[PDB]
Design a protein around this ligand. Sequence first.
Ligand code: MET
Ligand code: NA
Ligand code: NA
Length: 502
Amino acid sequence: REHWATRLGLILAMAGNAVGLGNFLRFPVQAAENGGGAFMIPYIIAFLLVGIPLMWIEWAMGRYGGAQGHGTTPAIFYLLWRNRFAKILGVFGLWIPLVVAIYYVYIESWTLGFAIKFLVGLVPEPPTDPDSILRPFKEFLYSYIGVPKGDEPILKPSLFAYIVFLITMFINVSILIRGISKGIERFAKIAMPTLFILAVFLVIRVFLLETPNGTAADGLNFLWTPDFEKLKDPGVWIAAVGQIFFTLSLGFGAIITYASYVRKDQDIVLSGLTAATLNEKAEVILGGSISIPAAVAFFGVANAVAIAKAGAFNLGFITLPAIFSQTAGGTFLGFLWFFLLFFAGLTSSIAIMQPMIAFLEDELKLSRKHAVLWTAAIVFFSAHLVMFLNKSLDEMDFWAGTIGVVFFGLTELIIFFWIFGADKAWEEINRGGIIKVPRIYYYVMRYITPAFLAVLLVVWAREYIPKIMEETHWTVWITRFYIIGLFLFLTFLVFLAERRRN
Ligand code: MET
Ligand code: NA
Ligand code: NA
């Protein structure tokens, strides 16, 4: 089996997996919609009671299976639990990261296209009226991805966006095709430091923004000023948990796959904690101190919150660059922003495609070259669905990137810490660890976490089961139909891999 060269490269590769678009786009939106500081309390708690324990759990499961030559859940779920149904559940460890990858890589190609256009200086040019400043950039984005005037089902991506997507795929391939140590690790040691530098620079530059409408300090205050009136709102807890799952790459089967390349004897405790810690630092300190403070600086808190609620991409691709264009060298500053997003996304995209690649290598015994090329072909082809079908992206991000990750997170925890045995799991986690997991986390993993997630899923299911059936748009049905087809396809591959063994 292939292994990580150094401990540092391992940390940066894992950090690269977690730290991504979720930090600089998803988080700011989530924190702003839930009342800033009010969102921080449930967020930290969710990080302690869910993020950390699951992180360690995924690392352990990854290394455990990796020792036997299996990096994907279909095989690992079977090693921990002997059953056909264990393999079927394991299919999600491929389905989720593949589905997510389909639209994630497209969003990534956006930041690249924007990065390129902002570098060359091809951007809209605003003249004191907020709408007259934002409109040009809204029209810019809509011209790029091909947004319809009314609410029409069809998208019309510009030739450029399409070509940029091809290029993005090519970049993802050139990195993945070189393997774990030569491809991902090498790039991690570069991308990450660069990412951190750009982030710090942007945070500082943004912190210097002060206008008659407010300052960046007002945004930092808003985000870090506690509010206990929102602690009774379940939605805030749900959003915080969802964010923790998405930002830490939990339930994507990505962490497990990456962990399967960790030598059986190497530590996974201190390594995992470091990766997760690096992600939170990059999330709350960096990600939360760029977008939000900037919007609050120019448009004040009320408007900033309004803009955050407006959409997930509205703050990142429209509002922020619009704000920069009003400052000296704002065009180049926008370039740095989109270059930051691109690297963060690139380090993450290669992580959610790896599970698929690792399954082809491990279970179907395909060479690394073929596995990567086929995985790229699949994602690229499937991507057309997100490119040309409106609301398709949201559907995939919901079923896979929201509901699926939590369900899968609960499933993997139940399989590892209950069925496989709590003591055996605990001993497997601490084995070879430079430091040891606090004894208390044994009862967080076994009791607190699964209960919290179970409750969360029940609540979710109750609200979504009626809405699903009554949904007018056909685009969403096509999407559901197709992703379901993907699931069958993967289940069929798992079947073939199972027969080859015999
Ligand atoms: C694409 S890996 C899962 C998502 C990633 N951790 C992010 O926050 O962007
Ligand atoms: Na990343
Ligand atoms: Na993250």
